[model samples]
Target: EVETFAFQAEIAQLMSLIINTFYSNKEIFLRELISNSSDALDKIRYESLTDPSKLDSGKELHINLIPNKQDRTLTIVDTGIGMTKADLINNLGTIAKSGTKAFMEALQAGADISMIGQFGVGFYSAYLVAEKVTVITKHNDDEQYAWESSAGGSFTVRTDTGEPMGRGTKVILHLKEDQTEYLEERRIKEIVKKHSQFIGYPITLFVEK
Candidate 1:
């Protein structure tokens, strides 16, 4: 492996045991993950957004939540500032900003789903529920890429050419067998409206018609 960054040794140790362990509530997971997507929308410049609905600036500045029972996946996609390979390494590998966004993505998909962008450590909180987490991100300046990891382990990254998400990021939380409640639309909606109501961005929930 090329040089990679782990959580602060003390933090990694502390959070690792908590990952895949427990959460006060699963619904709170969606709030923090949506919060991360909101940040991506905020990262762009006022002049950068031309469309009101699309975040292509995953699918432009908006947030998309897709819960798939068939795949047992809870997906949160955003068309915000997608990261490049370097950005991936820097963010996921190095400083690993928005770690809690990941934890939240993994939280219900899988913590509190607590996301504090630059503070880090929030992502690992997902380990409390998610067995594994996958991240797909695309940058305007770079091609698409996929990153994956498990609790108490390192993340691996590679080029992604399978399906292009235009210019954005997508995260999928592979839920455990017991935590099916998060897959419920009512739960997803409640969390979004509850935690992210104040965030200035479009957040959407997709469920079976």
Candidate 2:
């Protein structure tokens, strides 16, 4: 579960297509990641219903966006279910598990792929702007783990040394030079409203003014 693997051929091709043209605007990356964060929050809240102690941490369910223009880094942090090392590998490494087959089937049946949330490899869309991506996650059921990658089909996972976010995840994107457009406050807000306004959680933008 700690090792890395190559994406399926079909998945690679699909990723290439997406990176090249599927999303008309580059800003959808924020929406995609925030949407995924909302899903994680939903999962944890549903679990807490069955076990009230899950809320012992007193952490509010929300998404926070912090942009560091100095480093050209954008961090999207969420208070939601975090992934374990196994989850990191399974979720981050391969594409077969992303439910792409089902998505394709749904599309063939006249369903819109846009309405489908289980495209599996949506996380890779971060690479469209990032030169390096780092994920720090702490789960209720496992120890904290940090995952880092450069979109070169190789990544590393290690124990998180920083203070845990109680029970959630944070994804930090080191944006490439050309992708600096995402660092602007106005642009980030516009992207969120366009693609994730209906998302089930409040998304906040933190900028140094």
Top-lDDT structure, candidate number: 2
Q: Candidate 1 residues 156-197, lDDT tens each?
A: 778876787887778888987877777899987777777788
Q: Candidate 2: give its CA RMSD in angstroms.
A: 3.4
Which of the numbered candidates is closest to the native, going by highest TM-score? 2
Worst 10 residues of 1 by lDDT: 110-119
What TM value does model 2 have? 0.82
Model 2, 87-185: lDDT tens digits are: 877644454544656665665787643544466545666767787889999888888888887644466788887886788889999997988888889
Using all chains and alpha carbons, the TM-scores for the candidates as numbered come to: 0.76, 0.82
TM-score, prediction 1: 0.76
How high is the CA lDDT of each candidate model? 0.66, 0.76
